[PDB]
Amino acid sequence: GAMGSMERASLIQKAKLAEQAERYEDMAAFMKGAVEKGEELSCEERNLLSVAYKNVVGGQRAAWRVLSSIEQKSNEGSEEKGPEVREYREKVETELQGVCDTVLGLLDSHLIKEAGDAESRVFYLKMKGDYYRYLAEVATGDDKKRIIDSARSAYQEAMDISKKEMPPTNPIRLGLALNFSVFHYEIANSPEEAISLAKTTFDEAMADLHTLSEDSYKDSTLIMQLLRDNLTLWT
Amino acid sequence: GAMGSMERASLIQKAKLAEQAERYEDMAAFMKGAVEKGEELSCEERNLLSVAYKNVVGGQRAAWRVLSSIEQKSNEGSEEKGPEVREYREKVETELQGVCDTVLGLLDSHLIKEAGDAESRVFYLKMKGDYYRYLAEVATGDDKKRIIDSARSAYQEAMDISKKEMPPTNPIRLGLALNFSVFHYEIANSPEEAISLAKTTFDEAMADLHTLSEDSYKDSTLIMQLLRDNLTLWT
Amino acid sequence: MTMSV
Amino acid sequence: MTMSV
Numbered sequence A, B: 001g002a003m004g005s006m007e008r009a010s011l012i013q014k015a016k017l018a019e020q021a022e023r024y025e026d027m028a029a030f031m032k033g034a035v036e037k038g039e040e041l042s043c044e045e046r047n048l049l050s051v052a053y054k055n056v057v058g059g060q061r062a063a064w065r066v067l068s069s070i071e072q073k074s075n076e077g078s079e080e081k082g083p084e085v086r087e088y089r090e091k092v093e094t095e096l097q098g099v100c101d102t103v104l105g106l107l108d109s110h111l112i113k114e115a116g117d118a119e120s121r122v123f124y125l126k127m128k129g130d131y132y133r134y135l136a137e138v139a140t141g142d143d144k145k146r147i148i149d150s151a152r153s154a155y156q157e158a159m160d161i162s163k164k165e166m167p168p169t170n171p172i173r174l175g176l177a178l179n180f181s182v183f184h185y186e187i188a189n190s191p192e193e194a195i196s197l198a199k200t201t202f203d204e205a206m207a208d209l210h211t212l213s214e215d216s217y218k219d220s221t222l223i224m225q226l227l228r229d230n231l232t233l234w235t
Numbered sequence C, D: 001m002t003m004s005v
């Protein structure tokens, strides 16, 4: 890889610089280089990895949605404009799929296998579910049902671990549950499952806030608010 | 080029799709392909070209400024963190310079030479001034003074044309003057020139609004507000 | 807007 | 913020 000649510490340092400069494509490249050094990531390093690709793929998804909406309208009294909209949507889609494939490959080589602590293992399985979910969002062929099940299977293993090993207010446990509920609602055609999961997740975290130190769980509160937002939109 | 096999009309169509999806790097690639077909750009096509590279280089500049600020602080009681900040700032800087070189090459081959109508000629000379200005913003070696003068020379020729051929409320004439005043203030160490130019530009456009149709000059009003904003900040 | 994290 | 266009 192009990052093979750079020191691991320098990759991590430059990923944090790229984060400050909102250069997320660079940030993702540096963290991919860091993973490929073969050592496990620390808690802070896992966050750099996930934030980088979340933002890269986030922009691709938003652009794919714009184009796919234009494409849908073109297939409704709509004038034939030729192949250009489909071509450009496919271009963006193929690039999106390539980023998802890259992330999934990294998790498979060798983040998931080497993760023993529950936090890291749930973290990486959540990521695996997310990037299979993004592949599902654009899937339309024979593989859609298989891609959906790959996301479910990853999310479910993460869920089983998080309930056995983590407290209900753990931010990774909460964020896994948020995204699995989003999976149920938007991908798996299971809005009732999505709603039940978001509600029990929110309720069980509320009941456990009393154990927590002030100012130590700002991320958990943010996620609980996202659960509450989704429930308000869904009910 | 990679766009050589695509029809000119399809490039223009896909540039407008990329604009709607805020994929400005793609937008710039499509419009570069369109220019390289060898035909002149229409008024609408010139706007697609300038908006695309304005946004690409705009992000690079913002990121360069973040990194250069971190670098400056590192050279103030500051701990030696090694070469990584300079390396990453140089990486972003070199990429920025490559985009500016690409734009300047397109203007030189062959947009400026083939432009006869005043609007297009002033438009392309403004662009030439802008991208030499962006090279000046990061220049620190022997070439800085030469790069500054290349921007001045381009802006000045545009200015001479716009005053002879265009009305004071023409949006291209106004935007040229705005950016030349920014050049004076931020690049050429000439704040008094910047202020005088912004004031006479604003005043002469105000006196000519009476000739204009309602709702036909929203872009001119926006630029006049930007002139007013700069003057408020500068005085 | 459905939110994820 | 100095503005350009």
Ligand SMILES: C=CC(C)(C)OC[C@H]1O[C@H](O[C@@H]2C3=C([C@H](C)COC(C)=O)C[C@H](O)[C@]3(C)/C=C3/[C@@H](COC)CC[C@H]3[C@@H](C)[C@H]2O)[C@H](O)[C@@H](OC(C)=O)[C@@H]1O
Pocket (backbone or CB within 6 Å): A019, A047, A048, A050, A051, A054, A123, A124, A126, A127, A171, A172, A174, A175, A176, A217, A218, A219, A220, A222, A223, C005
């Ligand atoms: C990119 C790294 C930076 C910006 C340095 O840190 C990102 C964030 O990293 C941590 O927060 C994580 C985290 C998020 C928090 C919810 C953000 O919290 C606040 C108050 O801003 C969003 C990020 O994307 C990140 C890393 C993602 C995950 C998500 C990843 O799944 C694979 C699961 C849930 C969430 C967990 C890991 C959060 O703990 C921290 O606990 C946050 O600090 C505070 C005050 O809460 C910090 O903003």
Ligand SMILES: C=CC(C)(C)OC[C@H]1O[C@H](O[C@@H]2C3=C([C@H](C)COC(C)=O)C[C@H](O)[C@]3(C)/C=C3/[C@@H](COC)CC[C@H]3[C@@H](C)[C@H]2O)[C@H](O)[C@@H](OC(C)=O)[C@@H]1O
Pocket (backbone or CB within 6 Å): B019, B047, B048, B050, B051, B054, B123, B124, B126, B127, B171, B172, B174, B175, B176, B217, B218, B219, B220, B222, B223, D005
């Ligand atoms: C990318 C193309 C799109 C979004 C379709 O159009 C961009 C814009 O293109 C035109 O506006 C131009 C234009 C700008 C206007 C000031 C924006 O006006 C409003 C009210 O939004 C900003 C753009 O960057 C653009 C193309 C740039 C130039 C600038 C280029 O120098 C080489 C010189 C001044 C300015 C001129 C060319 C403006 O005429 C139009 O007159 C604008 O329409 C209105 C209602 O004013 C439209 O928003």
Ligand SMILES: [Cl-]
Pocket (backbone or CB within 6 Å): A087, A088, A091, B014
């Ligand atoms: Cl395409």
Ligand SMILES: [Cl-]
Pocket (backbone or CB within 6 Å): A014, B087, B088, B091
């Ligand atoms: Cl670098």
Ligand SMILES: [Mg+2]
Pocket (backbone or CB within 6 Å): A007, A008
């Ligand atoms: Mg080493």
Ligand SMILES: [Mg+2]
Pocket (backbone or CB within 6 Å): A090, A093, A094
């Ligand atoms: Mg496809």
Ligand SMILES: [Mg+2]
Pocket (backbone or CB within 6 Å): B007, B008
């Ligand atoms: Mg042809």
Ligand SMILES: [Mg+2]
Pocket (backbone or CB within 6 Å): B090, B093, B094
């Ligand atoms: Mg340099």
